[PDB]
Amino acid sequence: RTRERLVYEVRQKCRNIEDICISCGSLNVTLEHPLFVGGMCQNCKNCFLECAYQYDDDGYQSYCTICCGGREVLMCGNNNCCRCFCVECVDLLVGPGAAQAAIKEDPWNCYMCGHKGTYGLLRRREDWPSRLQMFFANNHDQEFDPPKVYPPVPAEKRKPIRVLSLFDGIATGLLVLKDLGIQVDRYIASEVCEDSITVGMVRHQGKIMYVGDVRSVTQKHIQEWGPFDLVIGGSPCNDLSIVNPARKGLYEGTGRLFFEFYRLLHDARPKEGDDRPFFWLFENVVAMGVSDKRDISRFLESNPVMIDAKEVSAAHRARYFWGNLPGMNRPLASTVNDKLELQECLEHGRIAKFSKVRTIDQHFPVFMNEKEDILWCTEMERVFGFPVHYTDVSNMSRLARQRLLGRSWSVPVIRHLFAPLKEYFACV
Amino acid sequence: RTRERLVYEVRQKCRNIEDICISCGSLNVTLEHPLFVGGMCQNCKNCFLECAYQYDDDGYQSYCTICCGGREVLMCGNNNCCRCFCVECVDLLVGPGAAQAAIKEDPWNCYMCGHKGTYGLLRRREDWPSRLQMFFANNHDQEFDPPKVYPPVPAEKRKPIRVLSLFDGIATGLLVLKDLGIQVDRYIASEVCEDSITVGMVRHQGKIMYVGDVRSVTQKHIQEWGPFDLVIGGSPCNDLSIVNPARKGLYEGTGRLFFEFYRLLHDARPKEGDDRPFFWLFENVVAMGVSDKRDISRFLESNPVMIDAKEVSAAHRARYFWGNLPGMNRPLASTVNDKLELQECLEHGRIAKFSKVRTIDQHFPVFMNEKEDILWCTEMERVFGFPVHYTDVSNMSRLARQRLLGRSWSVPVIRHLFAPLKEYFACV
Ligand SMILES: Nc1ncnc2c1ncn2[C@@H]1O[C@H](CSCC[C@H](N)C(=O)O)[C@@H](O)[C@H]1O
Ligand SMILES: Nc1ncnc2c1ncn2[C@@H]1O[C@H](CSCC[C@H](N)C(=O)O)[C@@H](O)[C@H]1O
Ligand SMILES: [Zn+2]
Ligand SMILES: [Zn+2]
Ligand SMILES: [Zn+2]
Ligand SMILES: [Zn+2]
Ligand SMILES: [Zn+2]
Numbered sequence A, B: 001r002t003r004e005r006l007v008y009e010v011r012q013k014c015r016n017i018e019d020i021c022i023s024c025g026s027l028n029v030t031l032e033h034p035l036f037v038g039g040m041c042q043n044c045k046n047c048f049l050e051c052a053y054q055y056d057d058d059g060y061q062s063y064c065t066i067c068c069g070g071r072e073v074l075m076c077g078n079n080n081c082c083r084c085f086c087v088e089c090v091d092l093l094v095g096p097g098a099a100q101a102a103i104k105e106d107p108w109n110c111y112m113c114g115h116k117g118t119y120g121l122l123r124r125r126e127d128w129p130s131r132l133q134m135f136f137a138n139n140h141d142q143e144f145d146p147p148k149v150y151p152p153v154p155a156e157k158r159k160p161i162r163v164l165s166l167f168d169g170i171a172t173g174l175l176v177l178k179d180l181g182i183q184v185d186r187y188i189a190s191e192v193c194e195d196s197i198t199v200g201m202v203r204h205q206g207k208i209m210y211v212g213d214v215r216s217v218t219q220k221h222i223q224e225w226g227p228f229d230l231v232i233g234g235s236p237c238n239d240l241s242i243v244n245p246a247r248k249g250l251y252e253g254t255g256r257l258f259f260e261f262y263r264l265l266h267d268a269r270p271k272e273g274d275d276r277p278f279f280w281l282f283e284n285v286v287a288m289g290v291s292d293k294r295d296i297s298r299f300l301e302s303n304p305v306m307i308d309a310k311e312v313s314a315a316h317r318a319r320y321f322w323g324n325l326p327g328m329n330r331p332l333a334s335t336v337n338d339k340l341e342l343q344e345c346l347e348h349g350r351i352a353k354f355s356k357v358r359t360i361d362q363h364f365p366v367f368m369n370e371k372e373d374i375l376w377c378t379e380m381e382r383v384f385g386f387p388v389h390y391t392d393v394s395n396m397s398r399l400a401r402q403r404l405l406g407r408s409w410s411v412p413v414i415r416h417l418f419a420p421l422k423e424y425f426a427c428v
């Protein structure tokens, strides 16, 4: 209303569009909007951090792309595009008579996919994926000191790595360490779900020493299980994401379990004066709260690094990584073994309409024998870069096993992160 | 009817689809259909040669893609695709109830653009661009001897080239020779249209010696204007194409003018025993008659080479080249100066809906300021690889000047053809 008056004053060439916050009309313009033209206030930045990568059950976005709010959104008909524009923003930026006429247009593209990209009051920024990548380096609100860089140990003095993995799951971390060829002295792993225990037990041949709940692990246990060289972990994102219809709380349950990772990290950290190389990785999803992200950043005493798996795999798996692993910032490289198209990850006799599937109405992504079908479990394993038939251990249902796969880290992303640890520990 | 009974016998698994000609149902199966599954009789090959690259004023194909005939065609809604499938072929290859239901589907893709690409009675063969390229090397019906290869003259003995150009137009051939840096001793050029004379006169600075009509050039004129080292030419394709609505004849007018090229070629050819390097190029369009193409091949005593300009420029300019220039067969290489996208050839402030434009309701190809607009004349010059503002010589209308541009050869294609002549003649 006020913001509509503001945009009116802009289009009469009395105000610039870059001096106003196009999302909510605030005069407190600190940032520029990354995708489109206009300013950006800090409250809208927080709403943009929370809401931008939130998708409905539909597969399309939970909220409007422009303001991250809105009332009734307009979904994009273009293939593989999931954006939504609410009616109130299109009333401004395209005009008050063009939203209604654009609904009537049955093949309707959105304004990030428009074959032009230059409209009257709304024009798209020259480099938006670059500004989306820079927008998370723009999160300097939480300013910290850089992680301490330890000088590399000589190759003759290297020893097998010792990993304390919390929230192990299906043993993605040890699998990636074996893929890199790093000698593993021992791999302690706390985990509760029996199926994920079992996957790890069979795929890693009894090498993993299994613990009960993370809440049963004392500091005495951490001291007596040998010094650890690498502590890894990732909080549950079943409740923390907006994909679950049952969002009774946000940091009930999952939040607790983060602090369990925090405590055992401090229990495994060497003392000051003990300059031995120690490393740690935490992982969380991007569709999360701001104050949540702040508290996590403050407790772990570091700046998160967003890493999307689209750069290396066939999925849209954008995840925050906290840590001190060297080269956590450096850009991702996709090897020729990694399959950047979805079609390569399909079985034979199946052809994909999508090029990237995202799993946290075309719910089922595969057109085989003139019929819609979901990705088979072994293909979902291929999508994340697991070895072929990785989860076929025990007599478990398909729904459970898909659910067991979807929680897991993306394997070439974790390979990219763990790769400079070869410089610090022994090889096979 | 008979072919519909035949396909009925094929769906019972009593006959292979590859043993029948899917176009017209003939049992005389010599070839396989290049795009889809099925045989191909020779009459259908001739109909395929004539009709496949024929486009209506719409921009879309003149006839069906499958059988090159049909009754009522179904046009494809996908962007940049111009194929049409007639109702009678879709009755077979997809089914007698699916054509009617596929009309009702408003975003309808065709079966060369189908996301799945695998239908019940119609499937798409995999290496179809390779088989489309091989299909014109499959024209061995006109078998001839290969063009005589002359050994290269040493670099100190090279002399400036002497070109007899017939049907010069806007002096594309001399411009391409100057682009290559070859010294030109003289450039005789017959041409009748004043505007094209004038373009050549101004852009090539009075170097061109202009003649009247080609029918006024005697063998005495050919002898007295010096020995020629390179004779080039191209028949008019205004009447010869199906794009002109006034197709009263096919080889009235244009056919004559071909024979004028034929005669003056023989008049410019050195005698047997005179082993001096002599070369010649003829050009014609691909949407032409078969017996036309035969007669041309027989008179010029060679096999045509189809060359599409899409490989090097932003247009679809598929043209037959007869000649003896070395490396006329070898595959086209597009330099970094050549613009393979249409958008790069646009002016600033204009954004293209297409990536390629071919011009022999999206009739106007450019979305600028919420409005549909023709390519400007200087952009059409950029599309074919002419220098910028090439035709802005005299006070001529826009319709005439566009018409003057559209007839012309594609400049990087002619650069690709003329390039090995540097090995035979002097450089600047
Ligand atoms: N208290 C607890 N202790 C250990 N594991 C727990 C736990 N509560 C939940 N989990 C498990 O921890 C996982 C959360 S996320 C798992 C991702 C893991 N990196 C992987 O690649 O598999 C789930 O498998 C969940 O069942
Ligand atoms: N009898 C004739 N003598 C010479 N030129 C003729 C002619 N009849 C037609 N022409 C011209 O020859 C051209 C046919 S095609 C021209 C293409 C030429 N290579 C170019 O790049 O411009 C047209 O410009 C036409 O006007
Ligand atoms: Zn705001
Ligand atoms: Zn909005
Ligand atoms: Zn879109
Ligand atoms: Zn036939
Ligand atoms: Zn047909």
Ligand SMILES: [Zn+2]
Residues within 6 Å of the ligand: B076, B077, B078, B081, B082, B083, B109, B110, B111, B112, B113, B114
């Ligand atoms: Zn199509």
